[PDB]
Amino acid sequence: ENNAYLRDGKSNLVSKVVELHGETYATTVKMGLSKTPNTATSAKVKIDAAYLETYNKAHNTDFALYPQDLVTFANEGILTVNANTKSAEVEMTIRAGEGLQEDKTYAIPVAISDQSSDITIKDEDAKHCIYLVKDMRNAGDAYKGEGVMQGYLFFEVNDVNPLNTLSFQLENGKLLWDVVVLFAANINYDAEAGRPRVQCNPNVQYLLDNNETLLQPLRRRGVKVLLGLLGNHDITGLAQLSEQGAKDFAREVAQYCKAYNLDGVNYDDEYSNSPDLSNPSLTNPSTAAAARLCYETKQAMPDKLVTVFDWGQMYGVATVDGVDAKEWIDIVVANYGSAAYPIGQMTKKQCSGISMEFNLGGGGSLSASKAQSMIDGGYGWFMGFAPSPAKYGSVFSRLQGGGEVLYGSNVAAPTIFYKKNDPTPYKYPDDL
Numbered sequence: 001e002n003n004a005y006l007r008d009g010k011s012n013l014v015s016k017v018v019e020l021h022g023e024t025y026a027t028t029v030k031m032g033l034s035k036t037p038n039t040a041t042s043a044k045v046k047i048d049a050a051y052l053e054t055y056n057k058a059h060n061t062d063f064a065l066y067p068q069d070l071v072t073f074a075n076e077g078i079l080t081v082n083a084n085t086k087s088a089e090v091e092m093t094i095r096a097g098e099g100l101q102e103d104k105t106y107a108i109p110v111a112i113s114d115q116s117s118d119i120t121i122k123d124e125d126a127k128h129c130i131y132l133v134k135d136m137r138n139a140g141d142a143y144k145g146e147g148v149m150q151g152y153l154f155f156e157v158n159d160v161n162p163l164n165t166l167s168f169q170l171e172n173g174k175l176l177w178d179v180v181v182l183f184a185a186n187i188n189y190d191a192e193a194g195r196p197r198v199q200c201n202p203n204v205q206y207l208l209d210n211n212e213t214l215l216q217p218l219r220r221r222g223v224k225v226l227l228g229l230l231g232n233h234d235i236t237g238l239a240q241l242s243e244q245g246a247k248d249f250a251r252e253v254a255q256y257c258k259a260y261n262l263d264g265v266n267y268d269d270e271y272s273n274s275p276d277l278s279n280p281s282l283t284n285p286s287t288a289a290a291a292r293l294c295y296e297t298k299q300a301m302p303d304k305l306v307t308v309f310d311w312g313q314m315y316g317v318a319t320v321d322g323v324d325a326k327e328w329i330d331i332v333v334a335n336y337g338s339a340a341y342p343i344g345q346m347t348k349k350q351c352s353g354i355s356m357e358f359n360l361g362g363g364g365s366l367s368a369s370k371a372q373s374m375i376d377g378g379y380g381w382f383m384g385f386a387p388s389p390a391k392y393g394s395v396f397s398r399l400q401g402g403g404e405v406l407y408g409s410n411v412a413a414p415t416i417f418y419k420k421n422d423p424t425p426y427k428y429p430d431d432l
């Protein structure tokens with residue numbers, strides 16, 4: 001008995017979000033084996049359309065099936081066995097189609113099929129992997145290429161309109177900041193429900209209410225918009241939910257990201273007070289509880305980003321219920337002056353190599369030398385916090401030189417900015 005399971009071969013993820021930026025996307029599907037195979041070991045893979053209803057019910061999702069005629073396995077779906085690496089793989093190609101909708105996630109559930117009798121499949125999870133496909137061909141302006149570093153920017157939305165993301169372009173016209181965070185909605189106690197709830201201050205709520213004009217223009221150009229969550233001075237907190245409390249709060253976060261058509265969350269474990277341990281939604285504060293919340297949030301929105309600030313007790317436990325952090329931490333950004341580090345089977349491609357405090361000044365600059373150092377170190381992200389038009393002189397000074405190294409194109413000097421809650425692009429600096 002040789003136990004098998006399935007995953008995407010390029011990412012090593014059992015659940016993999018695919019962004020189509022061109023007409024084709026190629027990967028491999030990999031079966032991992034627990035023992036050395038023999039000469040007769042064999043298996044195939046197939047799209048398992050029937051499994052999608054089971055998957056959607058389990059995750060409370062509603063993904064449509066990606067058109068099967070657009071998906072091809074090489075070699076009739078037969079997996080080529082590598083006895084020395086205890087694995088077997090086959091190439092899978094995803095073609096972009098006509099009649100697919102923008103801004104919709106489709107699913108390719110893949111199953112092991114026709115396995116030889118020496119292979120044992122423990123359950124339906126091990127039998128399957130899943131691709132969650134989004135057509136990004138037209139929402140291409142933040143996409144700077146394969147393998148480049150990407151930007152992650154927090155807006156203090158109490159003060160600054162996130163449309164200022166659009167102030168930041170390279171000379172080649174690409175948008176610098178791949179991911180932006182609305183900092184921040186809060187976790188707070190709801191006495192009427194006896195559980196935590198998402199609590200949005202009036203500035204956060206105004207953005208959500210007006211997401212068509214103040215948030216969706218970013219997404220139309222390919223920027224991912226995340227809702228920031230932050231502790232907020234009561235017994236609830238992002239690193240102190242029980243298993244049940246985390247499951248419930250994760251569903252509320254996913255419901256915000258669905259209702260307002262956002263791209264995921266940032267969790268920042270700060271400002272909470274000590275929990276009431278008699279409340280069943282709460283538990284002793286711990287990095288294990290934080291990891292539980294991240295895992296449950298990814299299960300509730302597998303198509304969306306689950307990201308963390310590495311501060312407090314938010315990051316560090318590398319498995320939940322046997323599932324490695326690679327499956328439920330998409331990006332981790334560190335405190336100003338530090339570089340993030342991976343846990344579990346994450347790589348530094350999921351990590352920030354610099355965090356720049358744009359309002360107060362700390363964390364260094366995205367210079368040519370720093371860009372090269374971060375590439376050499378294998379980092380995926382650079383993070384910035386609290387840029388504002390009033391400080392664009394400083395902000396853009398700290399971005400000089402790095403873009404030529406990361407992208408072959410420097411960041412251009414700003415010519416537009418946005419005022420709070422106002423969709424109008426104003427002239428920078430004339431209209432300040």
Ligand SMILES: CC(=O)N[C@@H]1[C@@H](O)[C@H](O[C@@H]2O[C@H](CO[C@H]3O[C@H](CO[C@H]4O[C@H](CO)[C@@H](O)[C@H](O)[C@@H]4O[C@H]4O[C@H](CO)[C@@H](O)[C@H](O)[C@@H]4O)[C@@H](O)[C@H](O[C@H]4O[C@H](CO)[C@@H](O)[C@H](O)[C@@H]4O[C@H]4O[C@H](CO)[C@@H](O)[C@H](O)[C@@H]4O)[C@@H]3O)[C@@H](O)[C@H](O[C@H]3O[C@H](CO)[C@@H](O)[C@H](O)[C@@H]3O[C@H]3O[C@H](CO)[C@@H](O)[C@H](O)[C@@H]3O[C@H]3O[C@H](CO)[C@@H](O)[C@H](O)[C@@H]3O)[C@@H]2O)[C@@H](CO)O[C@H]1O
Binds near residue numbers: 154156232233268
């Ligand atoms: C990632 C990442 O970086 N993560 C963090 C990040 O969080 C840090 O960001 C900074 O955070 C700090 C701390 O914020 C948290 O606390 C404050 C204060 O909360 C307490 O007081 C409130 C009233 O003021 C109470 O309502 C609240 O309940 C708290 O009181 C309880 O607890 C204390 C004990 O701690 C007890 O004493 C009390 O009794 C009570 O029990 C809080 O306001 C913050 O929450 C708001 O903001 C977050 C988003 O950041 C939202 O998610 C929240 O909903 C909330 O906003 C809403 O409520 C507030 C009122 O609370 C409304 O005003 C608002 O409109 C919303 O409705 C957090 O819980 C902040 O202090 C920092 O703020 C400054 O910088 C930002 C920009 O980064 C500015 O937008 C902001 O205005 C602040 O700016 C001032 O200070 C700057 C220097 O720090 C300066 O550059 C600015 O020009 C400005 O200067 C002026 O004020 C100075 C004094 O503050 C003064 O010196 C100066 O002369 C000027 O007058 C910032 O957000 C970052 C930091 O790098 O790092 C990580 O740690």
Ligand SMILES: [Ca+2]
Binds near residue numbers: 316
């Ligand atoms: Ca910590």
